[PDB]
Amino acid sequence: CPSRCSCSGTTVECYSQGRTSVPTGIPAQTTYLDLETNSLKSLPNGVFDELTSLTQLYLGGNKLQSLPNGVFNKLTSLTYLNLSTNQLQSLPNGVFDKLTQLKELALNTNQLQSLPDGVFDKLTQLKDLRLYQNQLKSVPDGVFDRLTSLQYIWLHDNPWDCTCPGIRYLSEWINKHSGVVRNSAGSVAPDSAKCSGSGKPVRSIICP
Structure with missing residues (x-):
């Protein structure tokens, strides 16, 4: 198993170790990989391609600025993906399209200025989606329409543009x-998504 990491069964943990790259030597049978709280700034295309048994991938708390196209395409068994607390400005089109079994997707605390059209369309099993604390002024029309299993969504702390008809x-x-x-406190709070300048709840805006 990777030097400095902790391994048990098909679990590999390498968090809080100032790593700037994905360690070599991660067993192909790994189902749980934790690379949180490190210093990953970028990722080479295909870096995870051999880890096809992954069901839980934790990359939160790193320095990711962008993601290479197709970075998760071989991880079709993923059910949990944490990309929170990074520096993501955008996402590649269809980056999550092959993760049809995804149940949890955390994208909070990033620098997202936009989401690709239809970015969540294939995630029909998704139950938890976190988008709080980003730089989103808007979302694509219909972006959440196929999320039939969605039970929790976090939208607070985004500079939503409440101008009509866009909102x-x-x-x-x-x-x-x-x-x-x-909301941040974890409670049901439909008024937590707020408008950029007025501070009024996004859902209070009834476009003519």
Whole structure:
């Protein structure tokens, strides 16, 4: 198993070790890989391609600025993916398209300025989606429409542009899924997504 990491069964933990690259020697049978709280700034294309048994991948708390196209394409068994607390500005189109079994996706505390159209369309089993603390002024129309299993979503601390008609989709979606929105405290809070300048709840904006 990778030097300095801790391994048991098919679990590999290498968190908080100032790593700047994915360690070599991760067993192909690994199902749980924790590389959190390190210093990964980038990732080579195909870096995870051999780890096809992964179900849980933790990359939160790193310095990721971007992701290479297709970086998760071989990890079709993933059910949990943590990309929170990084420096992501954008995501490649269809980056999550092959992760059809995904249940949890954390993208909070990044620098996201936009989301690709249809980025979550294939994640029909997704139950938890975290997008709080980003730089999103808007989301693509219909971006959450196929998330039939969604039980929890976090949208707070984004500079939402509440100008009409652009805000219509998000305001209407929150209004129709009021019990799905969660605040930092972890409670149901449909008014936690707030408008950039007025500070008013996004769902309070009723476009003419």
